[PDB]
């Protein structure tokens, strides 16, 4: 997510007018923040990928 810099000054007429000038300006400093982790389930490994992983484990022996 592109970061939001803090609200510079309370007040919509003036402070937010120059806060749009600052945050959305052509020349700006888009710092990044990550989203909160979404609960990804583990991907099921395909069977051919398990005949690749298993063949190396047999080459251990």
């Amino acid at each position: 997510r592109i970061a939001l810099p803090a609200p510079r000054g309370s007040g919509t007429a003036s402070d937010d007018e120059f806060e749009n000038l600052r945050i959305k300006g052509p020349n700006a400093v888009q710092l990044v923040k990550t989203t909160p982790l979404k609960p990804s389930p583990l991907p099921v490994i395909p069977d051919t990928i398990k005949e690749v992983i298993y063949d190396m484990l047999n080459a251990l022996a």
Partner: protein
């Protein structure tokens, strides 16, 4: 252990070998799509923040 190379370092090697200079071009093509989406969401969140301030 830190001796083990990270995925980004393996992808870096792969990219180097398979496309040293075309990586920048792909970064540019994908950037054009990422920044536009994130700026739309940045402007929507900013509107949401101004709205919540006004409603407060």
């Amino acid at each position: 252990l830190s001796s083990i190379p990270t995925a980004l370092t393996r992808w870096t090697e792969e990219c180097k070998v398979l496309d040293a200079e075309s990586m920048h071009d792909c970064v540019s093509v994908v950037k054009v799509s990422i920044v536009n989406h994130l700026e739309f969401l940045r402007d929507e969140e900013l509107e949401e923040r101004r709205e919540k301030r006004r409603k407060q």
